[PDB]
Structure formats: structure tokens, C-alpha cells
């Protein structure tokens, strides 16, 4: 594999007997004017949960379902690097969007686990399972060009990636490649980790490119809404050229459906080059250079 799979751990903890951590910090990272709430929370793990960049953990909300059984676990991409927000390898962090919407019947639907997580106060316990997954593991190549495409909470695994790449010192992993993050959100009030990301850009100016796409507030020169694919289109020649290099790895995380718009601009780019994007994407997936985790 071309990914950091060495010593990988999956499901050390299962629903039947999860790890019980404690909330150390819970902070809303979206503005007051934001239409929806997203929270950044840090749980203690005592160094018992051996997760790595790109993995997820399952969370079992407190309470019971309509049948008296414990709630089914919900997966959340880990937003912290392996060393964690405190650099001590004894915590794990999540980036959670509170799911609340009204169906066509006028009935409010409050997501069970997302609201449970966002309502957590420091000191409160949390049932955790995992670590989970291997689709979004980082490339082994320390000079890899890493293109990260995210929408909303999809930023989570890339915050994890970026912490290891730019906020930490690893004698065995000194990142020298080009990291490029595209983050699409509806309003600037929902620009998750804006400060952190701009700080990374400040300390690694030539190695980190950061492009925000705020669809409801920005438009390109033509006046078109700035969706993630719209922002990508501002760099079409560069991106296509990079997609042809063997050390280029593309990761996509976030709302299912963000894939279509991205494929549309890729279809155009490849075609102009006499290439069928649908086929090329299959090849990139097989060569581990196109990794997707949408929900």
C-alpha cells in the first residue's frame, strides 16, 4: 500500500464493550449568525485508542432506542492527529454538525447522536468504538502532493492530516510536498477551523495552499456561486497537470453529492485533453490516488 497502514488498528473497541472517555472540552466553532451549529470536542482516551490520521470512531449516544436497546453507533471522522490537540497522544477530537431539520410533515427531526455530542459538557462520559477505517489514510510519501476536497464537517480528516504535516515534528515524517485544501461551506459563519488553517498557511506559505468556497457569499468573475467545484475551476490547468503526476493523492470528504460537481469539472478538463475522466478516475482509485469518504 501507498498509505500509512503500518500497525493499523481497527475496532479494538466494539459496541458490546466500548471505550468510555470523558469530554475535556466542547466548543462551538460556527458563528452566531450561522444557520447550523458545528462543535469541536476533545475526549480523553488515556492513550488507549490507537487511531491514526484519516480514521473514524463510532459514538454510542446515551439512552435507548424505541426498543430499549442501546443506540446504534454513528461514525465521526477524527479531527485530531494521532498525537492529538494536546500533543500528548491521550485525546481524540471530533468535528460535529448538530443535525436538526423539519421534514415535509412539519415534524422536527433532532439527530440522536449529533445532538448528544454537541450537548456534552466537560466531565461527561462518552461511549466510543473503533478506531474505524483505512480508506482515508495518509500517503507514505513525505513529498506527496496532497489535494484535499472538503465540504462542511468533511474538513475533519484533513485537519488531522494537516496537524501532523505542519504542527508537529516527526523525525520519521518530514513533509516537503504540496498540500492543497479546498473547503466548501454555505456561509463564512460556517468556515470550520478558519483561524487554525490560516495559521498553518502562515507558517508553511509555500507548502500549503488554502482555498475557501463560500457559495452563498462568493461568486467567480462570471457571477456564478462559489461551490467547491467552482473554486477548483479557478485552477483547472494546475489541478489537471497535478492529477497526471504519480505522487499526487486526492482525498474527498463531506456531504454526499459534492462528488458530482467535482466530476463535472474533471470531465471537462480530461476531455479537453482527449481523456475519459470516468476511466481515469477508476485508475486513480485503483492506484490509491483518489480516496473518497462522503456521507
Ligand X SMILES: Cc1cc2nc3c(=O)[nH]c(=O)nc-3n(C[C@H](O)[C@H](O)[C@H](O)COP(=O)(O)OP(=O)(O)OC[C@H]3O[C@@H](n4cnc5c(N)ncnc54)[C@H](O)[C@@H]3O)c2cc1C
As measured in angstroms, the least distance from the Cβ of 75 to ligand X is 4
CB 193 within 8 A of CB 29: yes
If one asks whether residue 203 binds ligand X (CB under 6 A), the answer comes out as no
DSSP secondary structure, 214-241, as one string: ETTT-B-TT--B--HHHHHGGGHHHHHH
- Helices 236-243 and 258-272: crossing angle in degrees, nearest 10, is 80
79/94 Cα distance (integer angstroms): 5
295 assigned to active site: yes
Active-site residue 13, yes or no? no
For residue 250, state whether it binds ligand X (rule: CB under 6 A). no
Give which of 81, 82, 59 is closest to 72, Cα–Cα: 59
User: What whole-number distance in Å separates Cα of residue 15 and Cα of residue 216?
Assistant: 40
Nearer to ligand X, 139 or 152 (CB): 152
Closest-CB residue for ligand X? 111
User: Pick from 8, 9, 112, 204: which binds ligand X (CB under 6 A)?
Assistant: 112
Q: With CB under 6 A as the contact rule, which of the stretches 21-29, 62-70, 72-80, 218-226 interacts with ligand X?
A: 72-80
User: Smallest Cα–Cα separation from 291: which of 83, 165, 114, 150?
Assistant: 150
Q: Cell for 153?
A: 464537517
Beta strands in the chain (DSSP E): 19-28, 38-44, 56-60, 74-77, 91-97, 100-102, 108-110, 125-132, 145-151, 179-185, 208-214, 248-254, 290-294
Name the segment binding ligand X (CB under 6 A); options: 91-99, 173-181, 202-210, 239-247: 91-99
85 binds ligand X (CB under 6 A): no
44 is catalytic: no
Residue selected from 42, 82, 95, 228 as contacting ligand X according to rule CB under 6 A: 95
Count of residues binding ligand X (CB under 6 A)?
Answer: 18
* Active site annotation includes 77: yes
Question: According to the binding rule CB under 6 A, does residue 178 interact with ligand X?
Answer: no
Least distance (Å) between residue 293 CB and ligand X: 5
Q: Which of 97, 272, 103 lies closest to 185 in space, CA to CA?
A: 97
Interaction of residue 37 with ligand X, rule CB under 6 A: no
Say which DSSP state 71 is in.
Answer: P
Residue 114 lies near ligand X (rule: CB under 6 A): yes
Strands (E), 152-230: 179-185, 208-214
Catalytic residues: 76-77, 253, 293, 295
Q: Residues forming the annotated binding site for NADP(+)?
A: 77, 97, 153, 185-186, 215-216, 225, 254-255, 293
Residues that bind ligand X (CB under 6 A): 56, 74-77, 95-97, 99, 109, 111-114, 153, 156, 293, 295
Q: Residues forming the annotated binding site?
A: 74-77, 95, 97, 101, 112-114, 153, 185-186, 215-216, 225, 254-255, 293
Amino acid at each position: 500500500s501507498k498509505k500509512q497502514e503500518e500497525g493499523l488498528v481497527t475496532n479494538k473497541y466494539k459496541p458490546k464493550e466500548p471505550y468510555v472517555g470523558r469530554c475535556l472540552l466542547n466548543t462551538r466553532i460556527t458563528g452566531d449568525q450561522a444557520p447550523g451549529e458545528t462543535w469541536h470536542m476533545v475526549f480523553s482516551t488515556e492513550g488507549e485508542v490507537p487511531y491514526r490520521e484519516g480514521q473514524s470512531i463510532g459514538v454510542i449516544a446515551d439512552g435507548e432506542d424505541k426498543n430499549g436497546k442501546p443506540h446504534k453507533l454513528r461514525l465521526y471522522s477524527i479531527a485530531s492527529s494521532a498525537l492529538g490537540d494536546f500533543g500528548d497522544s491521550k485525546t481524540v477530537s471530533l468535528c460535529v454538525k448538530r443535525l436538526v431539520y423539519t421534514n415535509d410533515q412539519g415534524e422536527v427531526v433532532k439527530g440522536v447522536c449529533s445532538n448528544f455530542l454537541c450537548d456534552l459538557k466537560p466531565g461527561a462520559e462518552v461511549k466510543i468504538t473503533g478506531p474505524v477505517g483505512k480508506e482515508m489514510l495518509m500517503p507514505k510519501d513525505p513529498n506527496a502532493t496532497i489535494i484535499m476536497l472538503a465540504t462542511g464537517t468533511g474538513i475533519a480528516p484533513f485537519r488531522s492530516f494537516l496537524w501532523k504535516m505542519f504542527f508537529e515534528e516527526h523525525e520519521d515524517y518530514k513533509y516537503t510536498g504540496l498540500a492543497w485544501l479546498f473547503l466548501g461551506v454555505p456561509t463564512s459563519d460556517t468556515l470550520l477551523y478558519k483561524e487554525e488553517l490560516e495559521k498553518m498557511k502562515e507558517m508553511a506559505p509555500d507548502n500549503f495552499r488554502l482555498d475557501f468556497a463560500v457559495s452563498r457569499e462568493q461568486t467567480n468573475a462570471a457571477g456564478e456561486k462559489m461551490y467547491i467545484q467552482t473554486r477548483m475551476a479557478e485552477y483547472k490547468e494546475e489541478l489537471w497537470e497535478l492529477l497526471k503526476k504519480d505522487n499526487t493523492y486526492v482525498y474527498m470528504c463531506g456531504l454526499k453529492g459534492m462528488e458530482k460537481g467535482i466530476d463535472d469539472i474533471m470531465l471537462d478538463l480530461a476531455a479537453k485533453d482527449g481523456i475519459n475522466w470516468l476511466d481515469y478516475k477508476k485508475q486513480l482509485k485503483k492506484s490509491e490516488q483518489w480516496n473518497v469518504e462522503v456521507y
